[PDB]
Design a protein around this ligand. Structure first.
Ligand SMILES: O=C(O)CC[C@@H]1N[C@H](C(=O)O)Cc2c1[nH]c1ccccc21
Ligand SMILES: O=C(O)CC[C@@H]1N[C@H](C(=O)O)Cc2c1[nH]c1ccccc21
Lengths: 275, 273
């Protein structure tokens, strides 16, 4: 599986192509319209994914017996598995059955859960990028020691900015984030002026320090292990802050990426490297 | 909750109305917030139904059950509460509170499921699937006869519930009869209509059948997906009689024009015969 997670960090998965073009073998969508089909594909795998992560996060809970975990999986999974497998994602289903296979140990289950979560998280990301959220706008309107420095670069925007990430604030989270990335950049479609990208990792570490996003300042950085393994730049568990001096570019980086996921479907990639 | 469940079976919830009128999104549009509300309620519903089914299982403690709830629920509950369904959230919080009997939980779970499944039913009906429509194109001794009718289309048909095929499912659905609910169409599956029946059945479904094998007039149940009643013009339930199968074509036409376009409610009543 991991081979194709890596493949799909660079390339759009073929599954996410047939869905946008309407070439799914089943031709889903009653009365010759795959708009409904596409919608179900996007949402079913997004929520299926959030489920997978939480299943994982309980694989880390030891009060639950692994056998009880496997059973909660055989209960929750098959409906999402089969429908997605019949509406655009055949392999994900088979791999879900591989995850449901008896776990000789708790760690084996945990590893399968996290791999597969990230597989479907990459697919979620790509669908999120190509789903036409635009039809709506036309009609429906209204310790200083531990801070590590890194640099975030948006191409082909050619805009770079710097950021600190407070390892002290969220140690387990920051270490996992530091462990790893050039990934497609997209915009939140309901929250407002924020962008996020699907970081290539599966962190189940608890986050003691979270912030209410209305208190969050500009260029605030946040990682959501739940809605993807997303990294979020606000122009919630907190990760870091883009330095104030460069906050002046984030706003147009925003408008650009909003056009990316709302209007253009033109890829906008974001790289995080550590200074 | 049950108070609200009954009230909603006939009346549009306030929540679905304010979201579909955008009087609860990014850059002054609500269609994304709507797409999210619709899908998250639908899927929180499937999750709740599988969690009740879990609640029947005796291998899992009620404390392990409650912690699997305390983790999978909030991501859906709190979010939906921000966009459309606040009371859904507060009641989810309360379902989580420590239960001392499997039954107490299982009851709150089932009512909450069905509350959410009605919210889903109304969301599916009002949700706009017409937008992409222009952009994206191409023992007989055992069965118990009942009858179905659609108003204001004024069309009826007699059908038989195969108790022999699914005894548990048959009883669970009959005990709700008579009822009259919203009938909507199947937006992805094809030529099938369905309606959200007012029950939450944990009945086994020993017999199931390919929807491609399902004849015209095939009645199937959808306990896994909103405990719905599906007529095809899957767990098996019944069949409309051969001489009445012909009357199903135009009501499917009208109900597709109802769910896809008009939104003018189409109601179906099922009564025992
Ligand atoms: O405060 C908000 O509106 C939501 C914040 C964030 N925004 C995303 C977007 O805007 O696309 C969608 C999304 C978010 N959090 C979630 C939790 C569960 C399921 C979906 C989401
Ligand atoms: O569409 C299909 O081929 C599947 C059959 C059914 N059809 C529904 C429709 O058409 O609205 C959508 C739907 C179905 N089963 C599901 C399971 C999970 C999530 C959604 C669904």
């Amino acid at each position: 599986l991991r081979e194709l997670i890596a493949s799909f960090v660079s390339e759009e998965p073929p599954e996410i192509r047939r869905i946008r073009t309407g070439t799914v073998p089943d031709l889903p969508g009653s009365y010759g319209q795959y708009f409904t089909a596409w919608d179900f594909s996007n949402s079913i795998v997004r929520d299926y994914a959030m489920n997978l992560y939480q299943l994982t996060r309980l694989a880390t809970d030891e009060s639950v017996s692994v056998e009880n975990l496997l059973t909660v999986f055989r209960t929750l999974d098959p409906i999402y598995s089969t429908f997605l497998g019949y509406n655009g994602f055949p392999v994900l289903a088979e791999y879900a059955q591989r995850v449901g296979q008896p776990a000789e140990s708790r760690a084996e289950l945990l590893d399968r859960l996290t791999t597969f979560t990230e597989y479907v998280n990459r697919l979620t990301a790509w669908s999120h990028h190509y789903f036409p959220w635009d039809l709506g706008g036309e009609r429906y309107r209204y310790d200083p020691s531990q801070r590590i420095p890194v640099r975030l670069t948006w191409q082909p925007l050619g805009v770079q900015v710097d950021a600190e990430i407070y390892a002290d604030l969220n140690p387990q989270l920051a270490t996992d984030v530091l462990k790893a990335f050039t990934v497609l950049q997209d915009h939140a479609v309901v929250s407002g002026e924020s962008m996020y990208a699907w970081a290539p990792l599966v962190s189940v570490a608890p986050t003691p320090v979270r912030e209410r996003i209305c208190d969050a300042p500009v260029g605030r950085l946040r990682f959501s292990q739940a809605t993807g393994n997303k990294v979020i730049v606000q122009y919630s568990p907190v990760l870091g802050k883009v330095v104030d001096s460069h906050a002046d570019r984030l706003a147009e980086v925003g408008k650009a990426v909003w056009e990316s996921t709302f209007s253009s479907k033109e890829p906008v990639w974001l790289t995080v490297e550590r200074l």
